[PDB]
Amino acid sequence: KKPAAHLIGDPSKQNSLLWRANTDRAFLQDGFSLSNNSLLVPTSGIYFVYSQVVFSPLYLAHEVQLFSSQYPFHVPLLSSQKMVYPGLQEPWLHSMYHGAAFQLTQGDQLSTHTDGIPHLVLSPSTVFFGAFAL
């Protein structure tokens, strides 16, 4: 038994990135759980955690962070930025993806915080966030 979660955004809310794991292509497996839009690490171990956002002076950002008791509180694990500047004549588009492998304790809380929400292209294809144990 090996845990994996795959969360997609709820497109109804468009002005906030709410994670849901109910659809046919979004799920919790073998122990993953949710807790105020955070993913609760089911067991201490090594996980590959990934997430992607798509966008359609403007600042764009999207970080997957790990919540901690000590010093910085919100410790980011995967972050990426992108500046788009006025001079907008085309249907510009952009996809920040990133995943990695981390050491996590049980009950760890993965959450994602993004700048440029109203530009998000909410879909099972584009905006998502999940992790799997190895």
Epitope: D30, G31, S33, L34, P42, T105, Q106
Partner: antibody
Framework: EVQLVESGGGLVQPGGSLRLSCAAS????????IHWVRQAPGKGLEWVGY????????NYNEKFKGRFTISSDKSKNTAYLQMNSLRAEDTAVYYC???????????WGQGTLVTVSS | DIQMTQSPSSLSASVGDRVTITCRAS??????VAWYQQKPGKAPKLLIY???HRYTGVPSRFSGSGSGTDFTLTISSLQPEDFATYYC?????????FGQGTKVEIKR
């Protein structure tokens, strides 16, 4: 083998305070979280919160946030629930339980009784 | 914050009967549901996780099913030690609520 043992339940007057202790043994204490679940006399089960004894990364059922505080002492394989300003609602059996994956309450304690009366 | 709703408050059944209890989720919950049997005064016991996997040491006569919104616990050959209050529980998201429970009185 795995053994959870609550202790310290008893009589508390309304608005009072009481702390419950849960002693662990038979699994490496610091790589598993301790839950606290309660149940009012002959009623359902209610999850209070949990604490990771390694990094103190507690997570509460908000119903008790800033009124209950779960701590732990990995030097003594023990989890703690302190409950402030107790009431009628809060009179119950208080269980501590350590899981397999987080949301699967696997092993339970025997539970301990806090009665809240005058 | 999800609620759960167990179908029979209680039920009488006789040894060997097929006992089936249903629990309905207030929203879709993938398949993250657990089933616990308690007994009197003693602590609950884990019977089923992830909606259908039996737990270590759970008698085969215990079986879990359910899809997304509605779930079901079934016992094939009801023993007398198969008596308690059976709680369902969404393991999907915190605060991991329990249904009301279902009490079983064996006929004799």
């Amino acid at each position: 083998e795995v053994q959870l043992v609550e202790s310290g339940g008893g009589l508390v007057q309304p608005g009072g305070s009481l702390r419950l202790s849960c002693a662990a043994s038979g699994y490496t204490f610091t790589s598993y979280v301790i839950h606290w679940v309660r149940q009012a006399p002959g009623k359902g089960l209610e999850w209070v919160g949990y604490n990771n004894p390694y990094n103190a990364g507690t997570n509460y059922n908000e119903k008790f946030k800033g009124r209950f505080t779960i701590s732990s002492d990995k030097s003594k394989n023990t989890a703690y629930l302190q409950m402030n300003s107790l009431r009628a609602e809060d009179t119950a059996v208080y269980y501590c339980s350590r899981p397999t994956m987080l949301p699967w309450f696997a092993y339970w304690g025997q539970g301990t009784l806090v009665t809240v009366s005058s | 914050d999800i609620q759960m709703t167990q179908s029979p408050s209680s039920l009488s059944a006789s040894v060997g009967d097929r006992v089936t209890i249903t629990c309905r989720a207030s929203q879709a919950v993938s398949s993250a549901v657990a089933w616990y049997q308690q007994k009197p005064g003693k602590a609950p016991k884990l019977l089923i996780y992830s909606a259908s996997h039996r737990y270590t040491g759970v008698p085969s006569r215990f079986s879990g099913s359910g899809s997304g919104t509605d779930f079901t616990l079934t016992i094939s050959s009801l023993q007398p030690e198969d008596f308690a209050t059976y709680y369902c529980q969404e393991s999907y998201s915190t605060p991991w609520t329990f249904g009301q429970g279902t009490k079983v009185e064996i006929k004799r």
